[PDB]
Homo-oligomer: A and B are copies of this chain.
Amino acid sequence: MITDSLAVVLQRRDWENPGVTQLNRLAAHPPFASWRNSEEARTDRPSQQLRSLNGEWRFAWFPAPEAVPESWLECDLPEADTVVVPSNWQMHGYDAPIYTNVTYPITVNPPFVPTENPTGCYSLTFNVDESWLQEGQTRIIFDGVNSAFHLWCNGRWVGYGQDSRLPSEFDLSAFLRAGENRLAVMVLRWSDGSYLEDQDMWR
């Protein structure tokens, strides 16, 4: 259903545009860990409230963002392999890593980016405890992403994140439903933001 559908969401494209770093992303804060017990915070014991999406992750790879199927958001593709996260897909060998000391690997036409950009979509299915849904606000957190990603929850568009190094937080409280909730994430190797960092390291 539009505008949740990929074609509407993809264009106008955000990543090509210099101006919008992210859409629907909560302001950055030092991590608190959200633990109700006073002792735990002083103790520093791992918080019950905090949850990890880390684990085996469904993965799909496409040459271009246009290429990836619209249908996927509703369901994970049958073909796609499961890849551990956090991971670098190039490390997996789906795409060869590219290293350049000074030059951006992509041709330099800011803010425009190469028409075909390797895109990997990660779909995660997890179950949220009933207690969480009833009260409070639940926000997904990504420690790092590159270059830029589009976030879909339960087949519904959630957010756009423009910076790989920084953590991005989106609120899933509306999206979440009792029982398992599918998570769909789309990552593009090359972003409008990509121009900002030309630092030389394996990319």
Query: What are the residues of chain B within 8 A of A7 when measuring CB–CB?
Result: 2-3
Asked if A8 is an interface residue, CB under 8 A from chain B, the answer is: yes
What is the copy number of this chain in the assembly?
2
The interface size of chain A toward B, counting residues with CB under 8 Å, comes to 13
CB contacts (< 8 Å) of A11 on chain B: these are 3
Q: Is the CB of A12 within 8 A of B23?
A: yes
User: Would A2 and B8 count as touching, CB distance under 8 A?
Assistant: yes
A41 on the B face (CB < 8 A): no
Query: Which B residues touch A2, using CB under 8 A?
Result: 2, 7-8
**A8 contacts across to B, CB distance below 8 A:** 2-3, 8
Assess whether A20 is interfacial by the CB under 8 Å rule.
yes
Q: For residue A90, give the distance in angstroms from its CB to the closest CB of chain B.
A: 31
A136 an interface residue at 8 Å Cβ cutoff? no
Q: Which residue of B lies closest to A5 (CB)?
A: B2
Mask for A58-96, Cβ within 8 A of B = 1, else 0?
A: 000000000000000000000000000000000000000
The reply to whether the CB of A19 lies closer than 8 angstroms to some CB of chain B is: yes
In contact, A12 and B3 (Cβ under 8 angstroms): yes
List the B side residues contacting A20 at CB < 8 Å: 19-20
What residues of chain B lie closer than 8 Å to A17, measured between beta carbons?
Answer: 23
Cα separation A8 to B11 with both chains bound (whole Å): 11
Smallest beta-carbon distance A165→chain B, Å: 19
**A159–B7 alpha-carbon span in the complex (Å):** 19
| Complex Cα–Cα for A84 and B19 (A) | 34
What residue of chain B has the Cβ atom nearest to residue A23's Cβ? Answer: B12
Most B CB contacts (10 A, CB to CB) among A7, A11, A12, A22 go to A12
Residues of B near A12 (CB, < 8 A) are 3, 23-24
